[PDB]
Amino acid sequence: SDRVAQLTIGNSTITTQEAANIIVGYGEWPSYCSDSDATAVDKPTRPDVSVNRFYTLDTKLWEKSSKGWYWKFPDVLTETGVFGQNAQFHYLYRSGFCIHVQCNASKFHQGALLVAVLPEYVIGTVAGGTGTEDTHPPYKQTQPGADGFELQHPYVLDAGIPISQLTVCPHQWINLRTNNCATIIVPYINALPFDSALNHCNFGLLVVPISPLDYDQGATPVIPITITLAPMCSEFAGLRQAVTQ
Amino acid sequence: GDRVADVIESSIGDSVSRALTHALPAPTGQNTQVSSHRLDTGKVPALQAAEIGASSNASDESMIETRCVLNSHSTAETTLDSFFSRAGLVGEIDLPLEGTTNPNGYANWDIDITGYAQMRRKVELFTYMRFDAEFTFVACTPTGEVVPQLLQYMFVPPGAPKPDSRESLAWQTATNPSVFVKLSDPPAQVSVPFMSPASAYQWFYDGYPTFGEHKQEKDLEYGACPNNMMGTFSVRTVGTSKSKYPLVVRIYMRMKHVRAWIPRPMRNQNYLFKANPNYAGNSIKPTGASRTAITTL
Amino acid sequence: EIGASSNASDESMIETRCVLNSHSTAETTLDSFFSRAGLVGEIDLPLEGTTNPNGYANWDIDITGYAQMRRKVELFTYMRFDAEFTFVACTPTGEVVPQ
Amino acid sequence: LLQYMFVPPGAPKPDSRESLAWQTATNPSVFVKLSDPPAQVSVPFMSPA
Amino acid sequence: GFPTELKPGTNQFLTTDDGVSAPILPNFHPTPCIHIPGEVRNLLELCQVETILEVNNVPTNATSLMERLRFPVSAQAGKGELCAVFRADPGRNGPWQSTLLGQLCGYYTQWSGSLEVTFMFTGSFMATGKMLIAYTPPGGPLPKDRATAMLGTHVIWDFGLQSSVTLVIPWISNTHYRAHARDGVFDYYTTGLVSIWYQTNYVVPIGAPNTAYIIALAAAQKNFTMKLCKDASDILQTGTIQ
Amino acid sequence: GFPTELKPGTNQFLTTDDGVSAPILPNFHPTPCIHIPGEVRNLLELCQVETILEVNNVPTNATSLMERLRFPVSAQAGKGELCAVFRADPGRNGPWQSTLLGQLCGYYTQWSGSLEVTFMFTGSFMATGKMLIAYTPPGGPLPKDRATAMLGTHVIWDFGLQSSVTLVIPWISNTHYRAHARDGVFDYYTTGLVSIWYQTNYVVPIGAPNTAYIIALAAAQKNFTMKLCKDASDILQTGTIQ
Amino acid sequence: GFPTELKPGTNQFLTTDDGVSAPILPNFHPTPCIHIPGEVRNLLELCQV
Amino acid sequence: ATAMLGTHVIWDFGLQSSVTLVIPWISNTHYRAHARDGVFDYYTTGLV
Amino acid sequence: SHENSNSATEGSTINYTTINYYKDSYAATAGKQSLKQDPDKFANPVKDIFTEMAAPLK
Amino acid sequence: SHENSNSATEGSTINYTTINYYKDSYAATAGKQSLKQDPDKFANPVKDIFTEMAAPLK
Ligand SMILES: CCO/N=C/c1ccc(OCC[C@@H](C)CCN2CCN(c3ccnc(C(N)=O)c3)C2=O)cc1
C-alpha cells in the first residue's frame, strides 16, 4: 500500500510491486510559469501528452566493480521523440521531471544504489593530476546525452565535493533487499523562468552504488539498471528553425 | 471558447506550484516532554526505512525515558544573515612602483569573489543566492604604513570603457560611480545592490554561455555565466605623475539581506582556480581524519 | 511620412501571452541620469611653469572642456538646474600636503 | 595599520603575519590605525555555563 | 558635546552620493521659469521616437556617408533572394549605433523590452512588391534561405499606398534583462537576427526606375526599460578641448 | 555646528559591524525575484537532514575512499563480539567530518542538542541478525565487552523488512552547551562513545553472501542549536587561487 | 551632511566613561542563567558580615 | 528505444502474477473490417 | 521646515521628496522625481490622431 | 521613511527590522530576520507521509 505503485502519464504506464514511496523534490510539484514570473511575451506552446510521457532511454549493467554513472537533464531527451523536436525548434524551454530508476534482483542478491538529483551539476577535471594544469571537461562529458557517463572519482563526485553529503539533495536508495526502484519528482529549478534546453542542464541524475553488488556463483550475474523519465508541464517559446546545439 | 471535455477538464496552465511543506516559527530549540516505558506491539518508532529518502522521525521521547526540559536556546545565530553578514577578504590589488604587474599606477580587477577559500566555501553551500552587499576598501603600503596618498576607485560595469592608463579619459567618471579617498582616511565603504539580470547569482552553472560547436578550444567557457559577471573595479593613484609610494588595496565584502536556494555538499578538496571546481587528481584526500581500525579510537 | 512613430504593438503582430511587467522606469529620470558627479575642470598651480607660476589662477566657469559630461548635457537644448560642486586638491603625484 | 581578530576555540590560530586565517570571513576582526583613537567593542557573556 | 563615533566611509567623496551641501548664495532667488515647449521627463520618452537605422553601414568615405541611411531593392529573378541582414542587438556595434535608442542605450548596462523597426519604401508609385522580413530569436544561425527564415517571427510586407510596414522584435529572452551583447561569452545576451527577403519580386512598368531605396526607422516599445547607469563606450575627444 | 564629541572606536572597521553605507547606484531597482524551489532560511534546517557518516574512516588510498561510506558485518562465533566503535562528538575529528552536520558545526563554537544515527542494513533479504548499539555518556571508557556497553543507553536492532534502525544520542551534558571537544582539557566537552555489538549473530542460508554492509546516516534532533559563529578549522587552499 | 562641531574631550579614553560600543557578535544569545545561591547585590551587604 | 515511443506498460513481477496491456481503440474510421495482406491492411490495428 | 523657495524646480509639474539642513532649498538633495511620461509630445505630435487598426493615410 | 524599494529581500516571506539614512533601501542594515524554519522541505519531502509509530514500509 506504499510498496505497490502505478505511474500513468501520457500513453505510458509504469508499475512496481516493491517501491519505497515517492520523493517530491524540495517539497513542490512541477507547475507552469505564472504571468508574473514570465518575461518573454510570445504565447508559449504546451504540447501536453505528446511530450509529457515516460521515455526509457538507457540501461546500464551493475557490476561488482561499478563506480557509478550520471545523466544530465534535459540533455538526455534533446534528441528523443516529440519532446526533442520542441527543444530543438524553440529557444526557450521549461519543465519538471518524474524520474523512475529500475533495478530488480533476487532475495539472495545484495547491494545499495544511491539515486540523487543535483541541480547545476558542474563537472570538474583532475587538473592534470598535479593540479598545475587548468584543464576543462569536454562536451561529451558535460552533456553525455542518453548514454550518460561513468564517474571517475565517485568519492568527490568528479567535482571536488563529498558524495557522503549528496543526500542533502532529493534522493532515494535502491537497497535490493527492500525495493527495486526509485521515483523522484523534480520541479523546474533555475534562476530564470525559461532557458535553453541545449546550453543549460538544470540538474544531473546520479546513480551510485554505495554498498557493492554481491551474490554467490550460480545466481543471475547480469543485473541491469534502467532509466525511465517523463517531462512534466513542458512549455516552449521563441520559435524558429531546429537547432541541435 | 472551449467545448470538448478533455480541454475543459485539463490542468494545462496551472501556475500555482503546490507545496507539500510550510514554515513554522522556531525561535528556540524544541523542548523535551516527559515519557515513560512503552511495551507495545505495532508501534515501532525506532525502525525506519532510509530507502524512502527521508530522515528518521524518531525522537528522544520514544527511545528512552525522558524528563521535561524547557529549552530556551535561541536559533537566531544560524539565520542566513547571521552566517554571511560578516565581512571577509575577497580581493587584493597591488600597485607597486617597480614591478611586473601594475607599475603604471592603476589596476583593473574583475569582480569575482572566488579567489579566497574561506569566503568561497561558505557561499558554495548554496546554488543560488540573492543579496545586497557592503564593500569596505583597506589601503596601505606593503608594510602596513599609512601614507598621504589620494586614490580613485571606479566601478566599471560591463560595456563601460575600462581605463588603460593612470591618465585615461574614462576617469572623468561622469556616469560610473567613483570614490576618491585618502589612505589616511578610514577605509572607504559603500553599499551595493543586487545587480544581476537573473533573479539570483549562481555559484554553479552547468552549461555554456553561447550556441554552436563546443570544440576543445572553447571548453574554457563551460560553466561561464555572464549573469554573474558584474563588471570591473578600477583603481588609480590620482595624478599625471607616478606615485611616490607602493600600495596595496584589500577588498572586504559583507553580504546583507540574503536569500539562498538549493543547498549542496561542501567543498572537501582544495580549490585551484576561480572559474571552476577542478581538484588535484593525484591528491584526492579523505573528507576528514582517519584511524587504524574501525574497532579502536 | 506623417512624422509619427509606429503605433503597432507586440499584441497585434504575434500571438502573445500575458506578462505582468514590474520593471521600474526610475533610473531613467533626468536626475537619475545627470545627478552623478563628473569632471568639468582642472586648475594647475605649478611652482616653476609657464602658466600660473604666481600662486593663483582664474578659471572661466565653463563645463564644456570635457567630453563625457559635455556629450550628456548637449542631448538637450535648454536646461535648468542647481548643482553640487566638489573640489579635489593634491600635488601632481596625488600626494596630500599641509597647504 | 593593525588587525585584531578574535579566534574562538576551534577556529584556526594564525601562525604567521600572512596566515590564511586573516581572511577573517567569519571571526570578528577590527582594522585600525595607531593614529586613530583606541579601538573599542562590546563583548557578550560567552560561556557554556 | 554629544557622544559620536566615526564609521568607515568618513571623509570619502562618492560621486553618486546624494547629499546636502552648504549653499554659497544665501537668500538667492532664481529667475522665474517661463513656459518652454518640449520638456522631457524621462529618457524612455526618447527611446520611443524612431530614428534612422543604418542597415547599410558599409560605405566609409566622407562623400558616401549619406548612403548608409538607406538600402536598395530591385527587380530580381524570383528565387526568393536575400536583401539584407543585421543583428537586432540594440546596444551592440553595428546598425543600431546610428539610432538615438542605441546611443542612449549606451548609458545603461542592462535593458529589457520589445523593439520595432519600421521600413519605408521610397520607390515610385508605380513600383510594387512583397518582402518577407524575419526575426530569428537566439540560437538560430543566419538563415541560409527564405524557407528557413520563414520559420521564425516574420511579417510579409506588401508595397502600396501605405509606404511603411513595422516589424516588431518581441522581447524573447531567458533573462528578465539583457546586458549589452558583444563577441564572446556576452553573446549570451544576443537578441537575434533580422533578415529581409523577396517574397515575390520588385515589379515596375516601362518608364520607372529599376532600383529604389528603403529607409529603416527604429525605436523601442512601451515595455522597454533600462537599468544600471554607466558611461558610454565612447569619449568624443582626442586631446584637451581648448 | 551641533556640539559633538568623538568616542573610542572612531574610525575603526569592525567586520561584524551592522551599519549603514552610502548606496553607489541611486534609484536602482533589482531584477524581480521569481519563484525558485528549495529556499533555506536557517542552517538548522540542514542539520536535520541525514548524511553518510564515515564510521569506517580507515582506508586512505584514492581507489578505496568509497569503502569509508560503509562498514561490514558477517557470521561470527556467538561470543557477543564487537563490530565497530566511534566517538559521538560531532564537531571533532573523525567519522562525523563526513557529514554535513559536522561540517556546518565547524562554523560555530558551541552546540547543544540530541543527535541521531540511522543504520541501514544492505545485506540480502535472506540475511537476519540482531545487533546491540550502545551510547556511553561521558566518563565511561570504551566498553571492554557487550555486558559493559549494555549498561548505557542502547537499542537492540532486529534485521527485517524495515532496513533501518535509529540510535538516538540524547543530550546528556553537565553544561547547557558544549564547545568542540578535542584531546586535552577540552575533552571536558566530549559527548561519549558509540559501540556496536552482535546481540545474536548474522545468519544466512546456503546461497547468500556471508558478508554484508551497513551504511550509517547521521543528523541532529529538533532540540539542536548552535551559537557563537567562528571560522571553520579548514581553509581549502594551498597557494593563491588563480 | 548634518552640521556638527567637535568639542574638547574628543578622542579621549576615560576608563570610567559609561558608553556604547559596537557589538562583536551580532544576534548572539548567552547561555540562560540558572538559579545559583548566594547572589550579592551591593558591597554593603558584605560589610555587615 | 523505438517501441517505448508508443503506448506501453512496464511490468514488474511480484505477488500480482499478472499485468494488463490495453490496446486502446486508435483508428481513423469508426469501425475496422477484418485486416489482411493487401489493401485491407488499411484496417490493421498495429503491433505488440 | 520654513525655508526659502529658491530651488530650480520650485513650481514643477513633478513633486520631489528631499532632505535639507539649510534655509535655502537648492542646498537640498536630489531626492526622488515623479515617474510621469509623455512620449506622444515627441513620438506622435500629429494634429489629427490616427488609430492603430485603420490605415494612417485614407 | 519614504524611500525606494530596491532591497534584495523586498517581498520576502520573512520581514526584517532595519535602519537606513538614504533613499535606497539596500543601503540599510542587515537587521533581524524572521525565525521561521521548514526542515521537511529537505528532511522529509515524501508524497505520502508516514507516522513515527507505524512501520514506514507496509
Ligand atoms: C566607487 C565604486 O565602488 N564600487 C564598489 C563595488 C564593489 C563591488 C561590486 O560588485 C559586487 C558584485 C559581487 C557581490 C558579485 C560576486 N559574484 C556573484 C556571482 N559570482 C560568481 C559565480 C559563479 N562563478 C564565479 C567565478 N568567478 O567563477 C563567480 C560572483 O563572483 C560593484 C561595485
Side-chain angles (χ1 to χ4, degrees), chain B residues 51 60 77 130 196 254 290, chain F residues 18 31 68 114 221 228:
Chain B
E51 293 94 338
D60 302 46
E77 237 188 320
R130 180 188 177 99
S196 174
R254 174 181 154 251
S290 325
Chain F
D18 186 12
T31 299
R68 313 186 115 221
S114 304
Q221 299 282 67
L228 217 179

Side-chain angles (χ1 to χ4, degrees), chain C residues 5-22:
Chain C
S5 299
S6 180
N7 48 49
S9 53
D10 302 46
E11 283 84 347
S12 53
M13 293 305 287
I14 65 165
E15 284 192 66
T16 56
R17 65 166 292 158
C18 170
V19 179
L20 305 176
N21 192 333
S22 42

Side-chain angles (χ1 to χ4, degrees), chain B residues 90 109-115 120 123-124 127 129 131-137 152-157 173 176-180 188-196 200-205 223-225 227-234 251-253 255 273-277, chain E residues 12-16, chain F residues 24-25:
Chain B
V90 297
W109 180 65
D110 284 321
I111 301 175
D112 175 344
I113 71 180
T114 67
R120 182 163 170 181
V123 301
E124 299 198 323
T127 308
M129 281 183 85
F131 60 85
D132 297 311
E134 176 177 86
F135 276 74
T136 311
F137 306 102
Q152 191 189 333
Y153 307 135
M154 175 174 76
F155 171 47
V156 183
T173 195
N176 297 337
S178 286
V179 168
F180 289 83
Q189 200 175 63
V190 302
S191 282
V192 177
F194 176 65
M195 312 171 289
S196 174
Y201 296 126
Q202 69 191 91
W203 304 108
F204 297 102
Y205 173 66
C225 187
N227 291 336
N228 294 320
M229 300 177 207
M230 296 304 93
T232 302
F233 177 73
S234 309
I251 305 166
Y252 294 88
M253 178 187 78
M255 301 175 263
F273 314 96
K274 305 188 191 176
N276 56 67
Chain E
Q12 73 181 27
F13 168 41
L14 173 62
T15 62
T16 51
Chain F
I24 66 174
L25 291 170

Side-chain angles (χ1 to χ4, degrees), chain B residues 17 23 26 28-32 44-51 54-60 63-64 70-88 114-118 120-122 125-126 128 130 132 134-136 138 155 177 179 186-187 189-200 252 254 256 258-275 281 284-297, chain F residues 11-25 28-44 46 48-50 54-60 62 65 68 71-72 82-87 93-95 97-98 100 103-104 107-108 112 114-116 118 120-121 142 153-155 157-158 161-172 176-177 193 217 219 221-229 231-232 234-238 240-242:
Chain B
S17 56
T28 66
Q30 197 178 65
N31 299 338
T32 298
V44 66
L47 294 180
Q48 307 292 306
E51 293 94 338
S55 299
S56 180
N57 48 49
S59 53
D60 302 46
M63 293 305 287
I64 64 165
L70 305 176
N71 192 333
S72 42
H73 299 172
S74 182
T75 58
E77 237 188 320
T78 43
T79 53
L80 262 35
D81 264 18
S82 275
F83 184 64
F84 292 118
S85 205
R86 320 179 92 87
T114 67
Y116 299 75
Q118 288 199 324
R120 182 163 170 181
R121 189 175 190 249
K122 286 176 65 183
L125 162 64
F126 303 102
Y128 305 107
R130 180 188 177 99
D132 297 311
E134 176 177 86
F135 276 74
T136 311
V138 182
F155 171 47
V179 168
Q189 200 175 63
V190 302
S191 282
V192 177
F194 176 65
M195 312 171 289
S196 174
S199 298
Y252 294 88
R254 174 181 154 251
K256 58 182 188 181
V258 175
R259 296 186 65 185
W261 300 261
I262 312 295
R264 46 200 300 139
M266 294 187 86
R267 187 72 181 183
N268 72 332
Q269 297 306 315
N270 297 319
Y271 287 112
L272 302 178
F273 314 96
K274 305 188 191 176
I284 303 176
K285 63 180 177 183
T287 295
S290 325
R291 44 169 173 166
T292 57
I294 199 178
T295 50
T296 284
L297 292 187
Chain F
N11 292 342
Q12 73 181 27
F13 168 41
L14 173 62
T15 62
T16 51
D17 191 11
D18 186 12
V20 176
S21 296
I24 66 174
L25 291 170
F28 173 81
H29 284 270
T31 299
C33 189
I34 67 175
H35 177 69
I36 307 180
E39 181 170 10
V40 345
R41 294 185 185 65
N42 191 293
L43 299 187
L44 258 27
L46 307 181
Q48 297 184 50
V49 173
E50 316 179 323
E54 292 180 4
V55 173
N56 176 44
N57 59 323
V58 319
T60 47
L65 290 172
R68 313 186 115 221
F71 59 103
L82 169 66
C83 179
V85 310
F86 59 97
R87 284 206 175 73
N93 295 312
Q97 283 170 286
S98 63
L100 179 57
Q103 282 314 313
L104 292 172
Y107 287 97
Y108 288 87
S112 177
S114 304
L115 303 175
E116 64 93 352
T118 295
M120 177 178 74
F121 179 65
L142 186 61
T153 297
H154 69 284
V155 182
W157 178 25
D158 187 48
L161 301 176
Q162 308 306 300
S163 69
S164 325
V165 74
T166 288
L167 165 78
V168 169
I169 304 173
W171 174 254
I172 300 188
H176 266 263
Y177 286 88
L193 304 167
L217 299 148
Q221 299 282 67
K222 297 179 181 304
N223 64 341
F224 182 93
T225 61
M226 304 186 278
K227 86 175 185 178
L228 217 179
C229 257
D231 273 296
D234 301 309
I235 311 189
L236 303 189
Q237 126 188 65
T238 295
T240 65
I241 297 175
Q242 42 199 301

Side-chain angles (χ1 to χ4, degrees), chain A residues 9 23-25 27-33 52 94-98 184-189 230-235, chain B residues 11 13-19, chain F residues 35 37:
Chain A
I9 184 168
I23 286 302
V24 186
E28 57 176 86
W29 288 78
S31 71
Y32 294 90
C33 188
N52 300 317
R94 110 187 288 276
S95 94
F97 280 102
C98 179
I184 302 170
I185 293 176
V186 186
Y188 182 64
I189 303 170
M232 288 194 260
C233 305
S234 304
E235 291 187 281
Chain B
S11 56
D14 186 58
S15 64
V16 178
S17 56
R18 295 191 301 175
Chain F
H35 177 69

